[PDB]
């Protein structure tokens, strides 16, 4: 039995795709997260699940693997023939394999393809378009590995409650993308209020958390609907690098964004209207330049931190600019005076 299941720990941990909900037996413990860890979509995007959900899955599975009552059973993470659920569930167990079983992304993906099962559906973006850029499960696992490699997260210290608190629009709609360096959020409004259920936040709402977390600088990329004075008077620096919603940034805007961030001491809070497309795109440019993430790796990492980031042509833009951005990184490092 378990025909076509994917083995992750010899005779102990498996991943299965099942038409119907199975029943745990005296030998096999079955569990699914398809209805527990649910992606919140903007449009037709369906994943990857965010970093807090990865964390919650890993906690859940580690507990099952330490349970005495389950110690003599095979543990089987199962998902359905809903390919959008299945892709997220495969991403979750693959991410567990990378983070906790010390597998490479390629080894984890090999196990995911080991059984007799169809391929995994790639993740799409949050735009109205028909899908044009395939973000694969392997891409996401590569992004997890790179984020781990460069210390962009640490599940020994990750605070999932706080992540899931501040991601909500009533609490500021923000996520850290690079700890101590980049915070992404939706653009503040002139007056704090609640308009048609949807709460709006003024610049001053953010002053406490920013000050407490060494946020020194705000970069705005969308239309002005508040005075930059409101931040600068509070001691923050503020920069305007506007480009059209849904567009790709010019060479000039990229160079200026990078100049700002490279000459900035503390953390930088970046926003557009939603804090997803324009914001994710420019942050990715910096991370590609200075950490040599590939386009797929950074699109994965930023979406795992902040779902819906990097939209439509911005995806292909990052792929088309990768070689250039890596070269700009080499040139940047060739001028340093360190050691």
């Amino acid at each position: 039995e378990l025909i076509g299941a994917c083995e992750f720990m010899k005779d102990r941990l498996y991943f299965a795709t099942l038409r119907n909900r199975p029943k745990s037996t005296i030998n096999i413990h079955y569990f699914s997260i398809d209805e527990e860890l649910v992606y919140e979509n903007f449009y037709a995007d369906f994943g990857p699940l965010n970093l807090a959900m990865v964390y919650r899955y890993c906690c859940k599975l580690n507990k099952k693997l330490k349970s005495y009552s389950l110690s003599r059973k095979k543990i089987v993470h199962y998902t359905s023939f809903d390919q959008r659920k299945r892709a997220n569930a495969a991403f979750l167990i693959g991410a567990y394999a990378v983070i906790y079983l010390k597998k490479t992304p390629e080894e984890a993906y090999r196990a995911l393809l080991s059984g007799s099962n169809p391929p995994y559906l790639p993740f799409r973006d949050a735009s109205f378009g028909n899908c044009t850029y395939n973000l694969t499960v392997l891409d996401c696992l590569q992004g997890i590995r790179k984020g781990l490699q460069h210390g962009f997260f640490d599940f020994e210290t990750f605070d999932a409650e706080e992540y899931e608190h501040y991601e909500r629009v009533e609490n500021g709609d923000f996520n850290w993308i690079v700890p101590g360096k980049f915070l992404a959020f939706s653009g503040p409004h002139p007056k704090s209020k609640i308009e048609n259920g949807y709460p709006l936040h003024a610049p001053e709402a953010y002053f406490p958390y920013f000050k407490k977390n060494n946020v020194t600088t705000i970069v705005r990329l969308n239309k002005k609907i508040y005075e930059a004075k409101r931040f600068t008077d509070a001691g923050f620096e503020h920069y305007d690098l506007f480009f059209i919603d849904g567009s790709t940034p010019s060479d000039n805007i990229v160079r200026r964004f990078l100049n700002i961030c490279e000459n900035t001491e503390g953390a930088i809070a970046v926003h557009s209207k939603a804090g997803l497309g324009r914001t994710g795109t420019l942050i990715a440019c910096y991370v590609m330049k200075h950490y040599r993430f590939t386009h797929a790796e950074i699109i994965a990492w930023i979406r795992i931190c902040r779902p819906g980031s990097i939209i439509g042509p911005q995806q292909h833009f990052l792929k088309e600019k990768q070689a250039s951005l890596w070269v700009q990184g080499d040139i940047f490092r060739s001028k340093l005076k360190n050691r």
Binding site: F42, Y43, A126, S127, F128, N222, D245, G246, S272, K273, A274, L276, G277, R278, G308, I311, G312
Partner: peptide, 4 residues
């Protein structure tokens, strides 16, 4: 093309 940011969501709304």
């Amino acid at each position: 093309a940011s969501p709304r």
